[PDB]
């Protein structure tokens, strides 16, 4: 058969090379609007950073010939599909001005999005960029040759922020716009980004939350960006606030949208025209721990989708049941990774849940380059199945989010989860992963064990650092008593207050907790976290 | 109620711990026959090897002894006090302390003896330069004897404690030799197709190793073992690393129930015979969960976890402890090797039908620095499809993989539903598609019969049909040359009359030519699952 698909990123070249597999004398044509065709746009920051010499680090082991003499696979460059016709299953496509047009039996729309453009003045302006193309990615490298030296980012996405470490290790002085309450909104809540938050100032890199951009003033056509009524100057501005899926050609073909504006498709990934199979960027998919659709942008997401594509049109059954938003980013030296469900979207989901926050050594505490890692844990109540997880931290936060995840996805229990045999020896990780002391501190607040808050609760009452040396510490209703002195001291301990114990990083804050309560303390709050979020 | 504890291992003071949580009226007693209480074991090796100061530091936060389990937890620990019996009648324990003997009264009691070293019965083997890394006192005997000069060491036992000890041996630049009864090394973990890297970078790194051998003698005046083959290995330490003996002697001089392995059997809730008597830890039998089948799973993990629902119980709980995958992990030198879940020799011993892939995938985006390519092999049971086991081996990241496999195994995830699974990725940290995701679709793609994979071991007429760009390689004999990016037009070169065998770099492109070759016909095409990576 003849099989032709629109695209040429993750989504419609894995589409096209698992149709190769499967059959070997289909023609399969691939139509790719640009110059570059395969190219790890996932990888485009570490380009533009220096960990990446050249941009064809990005697509190696790739132009036509090489999908030509490897797959068969003939793609069509710098080419425009322009409209499809389902009734003559035909695609309409623009080659050296001269338009043309390629039959299908099958058909894989695999678009990906366009950067959304926020409206506002001066958008356009020379210097703005996105980090969506090589092309852009370059002309930041340009400008910095030509003697670029500040910049503003807008959004502290993972595409975001990971564009401001790339340019600060360009020597720019960087300072980010977000719209939101925290950095990196869809990944974190308040709480644990924060860190992230402090982490990257503490690399040079300045941050804003909770304001918007209201225009981009251009001299000569330059920049500068006006935040809540403040300009910071600006030699760039990439703007990385979101994306919008690519969905108009199959609007346009009577293609079911849906209500995230892009190509609706099933589980089996084809479109409301059985012969017409849509997935990657351009395509809605569902959130498998709330059942509502969304845009799941990813390139992980991409290739496992564009595969299903690919054994369906060679007759296979093969499902994508959806996703759980678990992604991922790297910061100078922290991680910032997140699985399952966030607050915000747990409320908009109607869950009823509860949360806990617990940091935990990244291997055992006695080996070498050991790191705290903080994680914060999201349960469904009554079920008691796991709904989201989220890390932050300096050492190996990655494997305990896929760990959670899959955990996630597994649909288990805290009590399942702390009983999870994992690969331990003192270089990989304590006696019980931090995964695993998570699970058991999550069910020690469930069964009601220890009552705890987190840090925001500012409320300045005494706080009781059960600690034991201070070189890092807070001012002040501060009662300092150490753990070991406990026991015996107490004395002080008053009663008929509320008293919150703050160890420094909550482990014997909770056995300071349960101390107080069998001496016959009433209000005794345990400080998630500790002092571990307390900046 | 005041509770009784055998022991200050893992499982005796977290167990102790947990009830001290929940209950602050409880008197418990924790009985101990050596001098230090809550020593790290798991770190000795790299105490040796040196990363770890002070054999000390293996019990600090940031020294935890009676005193301050006293202090902290108001838990009266008993030092060098040894329990010779338990009567359950009675409901008492009686211990010596000071070569006085004592009782002891309880309400609950839980026994955490832990294991000794199985001692294997030869000649010598009380002879001095002999240890086991089993308490702190052995291991600084192996210190001072390198201090009084020691250069040569023999371990016996490819296992974990074995492995580790030949790396901590060498760290002090030894010279160090292993010798191990079967024919691979980690036996319980690994097979042999995987278990040669981690010998080869054993050997790579200079610490010789010899399989398939038995020990017969040890000679000594102070050391020398003389191995299969009466090959003589000169020696001036030994360790022996040969497995271990639950120490439920006590519990069945009660007359409680001791399981098929030798352990003292216990139930999910973590209880024996007599309902006042918990055990937990490493004399405690467990279960395996993908084969039901009952075993002894001596870890650090697993006692901790145990000692908290123990805990949990006596203090008016339920507490479910399922039984465990035996997923291990450890690390020699630069690689790292993990197994999670059951293994291909216990798989045939329990009776499943399965089957296995072999596919190593970059440890990071291949552009990003530090990349490596780790090795996963998958056995994933028949009809199901469920994934049953996994072992990982190399230079990189592995521990993730095992990490996130294990997790599926114990969930029962089949190849289909794992090739989903919503992992972290971004160039730092994963490929596109994470080494477990790949895996995941070749093993549906021999499910499937997309194509035809057989491992590293081949005498029959074949062309070997070599996929590369450079060869610096199998060297010959019946190899033929033809790098994938020309094959698709070089084919009246490829005989179309012999079995054919495509071997590549790390397995993938081969199989793009093995479907490339399908396409053009030729049958009797199959292909060599692991690439050049499993090859000598
Ligand atoms: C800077 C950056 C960092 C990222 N980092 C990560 C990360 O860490 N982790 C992660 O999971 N994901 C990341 N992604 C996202 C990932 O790139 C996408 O999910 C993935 O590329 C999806 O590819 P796709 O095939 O859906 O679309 P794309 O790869 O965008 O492919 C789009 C192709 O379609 C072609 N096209 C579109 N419309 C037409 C038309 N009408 N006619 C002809 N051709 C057309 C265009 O030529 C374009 O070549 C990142 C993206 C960027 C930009
Ligand atoms: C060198 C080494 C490295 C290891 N590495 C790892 C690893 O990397 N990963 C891993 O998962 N596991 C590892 N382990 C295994 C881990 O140590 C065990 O799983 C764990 O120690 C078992 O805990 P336990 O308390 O049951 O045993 P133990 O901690 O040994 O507890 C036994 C205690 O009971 C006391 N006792 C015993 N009998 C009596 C009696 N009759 N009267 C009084 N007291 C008694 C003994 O004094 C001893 O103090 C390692 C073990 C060793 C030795
Ligand atoms: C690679 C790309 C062109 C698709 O090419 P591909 O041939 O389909 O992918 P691979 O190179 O890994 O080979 C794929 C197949 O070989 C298989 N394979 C067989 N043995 C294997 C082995 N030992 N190891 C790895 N893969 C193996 C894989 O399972 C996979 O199987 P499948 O055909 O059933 O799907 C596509 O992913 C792409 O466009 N990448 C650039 C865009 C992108 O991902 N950007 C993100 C930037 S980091
Ligand atoms: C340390 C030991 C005595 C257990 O004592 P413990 O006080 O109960 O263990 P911890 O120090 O971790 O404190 C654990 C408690 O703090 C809890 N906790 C509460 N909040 C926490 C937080 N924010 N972070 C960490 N732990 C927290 C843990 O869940 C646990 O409570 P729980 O199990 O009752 O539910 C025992 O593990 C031991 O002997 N270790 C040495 C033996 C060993 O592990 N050897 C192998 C060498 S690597
Ligand atoms: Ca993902
Ligand atoms: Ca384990």
């Known amino acids: 058969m003849n099989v032709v698909v629109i695209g040429g990123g993750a989504a419609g070249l894995k589409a096209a090379s698992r149709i190769r597999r499967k059959d070997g004398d289909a023609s399969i044509t691939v139509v ?8 790890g746009r996932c990888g485009l920051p570490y380009y533009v950073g220096g960990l990446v010499h050249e941009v064809d680090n990005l697509r190696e082991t790739r132009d036509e010939a090489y999908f030509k003499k490897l797959k068969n696979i003939d793609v069509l460059t710098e080419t425009v599909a322009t409209e499809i016709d389902r009734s003559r299953k035909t695609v309409k496509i623009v080659r050296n001005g001269s338009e043309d047009e390629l039959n299908y039996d099958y058909l894989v729309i695999a678009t ?9 003045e001066g958008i356009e302006a020379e210097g703005v960029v996105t980090l969506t193309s090589a092309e852009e990615a370059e002309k930041i490298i340009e400008m910095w040759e030509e003697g670029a030296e500040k910049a503003v980012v807008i959004g502290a996405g993972f595409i975001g ?29 308040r709480e ?5 938050e402090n982490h990257l100032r503490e690399k040079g890199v300045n941050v804003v939350t909770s304001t918007r951009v209201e225009k981009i003033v251009s001299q000569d056509d330059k920049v500068r960006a006006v935040i809540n009524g403040k300009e910071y100057p600006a030699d760039v501005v990439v703007v990385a606030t979101g994306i919008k899926p690519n969905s108009e050609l199959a609007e346009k073909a009577g293609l079911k949208i849906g209500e995230t504006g892009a190509i609706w498709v099933d589980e089996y990934m084809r479109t409301s025209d059985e012969s017409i199979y849509a997935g990657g960027d351009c395509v809605e998919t569902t959130c498998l721990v709330t059942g ?3 845009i799941a942008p990813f390139g992980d997401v991409a290739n496992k989708q564009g595969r299903v594509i690919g054994e369906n049109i060679t007759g296979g059954r093969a499902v994508f049941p959806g996703v759980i938003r678990t992604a991922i980013f790297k910061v100078f030296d922290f991680t910032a990774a997140s699985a399952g469900v966030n607050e915000q979207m747990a409320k908009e989901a109607g869950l009823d849940y509860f949360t806990v926050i617990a940091p935990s050594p990244d291997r055992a505490h006695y080996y070498p380059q050991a790191n705290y890692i903080r994680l914060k844990l999201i349960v469904e109540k009554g079920s008691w199945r796991v709904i989201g997880a989220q890390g932050v931290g300096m050492g190996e936060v990655a494997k305990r989010i896929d760990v959670l995840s899959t955990a996630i996805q597994a649909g288990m ?6 009983n999870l045999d994992l690969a331990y020896a003192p270089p990989y990780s304590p006696a019980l992963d931090p995964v695993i002391t998570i699970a058991n501190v999550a069910m020690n607040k469930r069964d009601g064990l220890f009552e705890g808050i987190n840090v925001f609760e500012l409320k300045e009452i005494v706080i009781l650092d059960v600690r034991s040396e201070e070189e890092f510490k807070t001012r002040r209703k501060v009662i300092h008593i150490p753990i070991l002195e406990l026991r ?6 008053p009663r008929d207050k509320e008293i919150v114990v703050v160890c420094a990083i909550g482990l014997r804050s909770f056995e300071a907790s349960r101390i107080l309560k069998h001496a016959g303390f009433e209000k005794v709050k345990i400080l998630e976290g500790g002092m571990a979020f307390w900046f």
């Open 161 to 189: 922020l990971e564009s401001a470490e790339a340019l600060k290790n360009l020597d720019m002085e960087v300072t980010v716009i977000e719209m939101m309450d925290r950095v990196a909104p869809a990944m974190l809540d």
């Open 192 to 196: 644990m980004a924060v860190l992230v």
């Open 413 to 418: 229990t805290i009590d399942q989860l702390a």
């Open 112 to 120: 990906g999005a366009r950067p959304a453009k926020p409206p506002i």
């Open 292 to 294: 509502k659709k969304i």
């Open 32 to 39: 790719e609007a640009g110059k570059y065709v395969s190219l």
């Open 488 to 493: 015996e001291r107490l004395d002080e301990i």
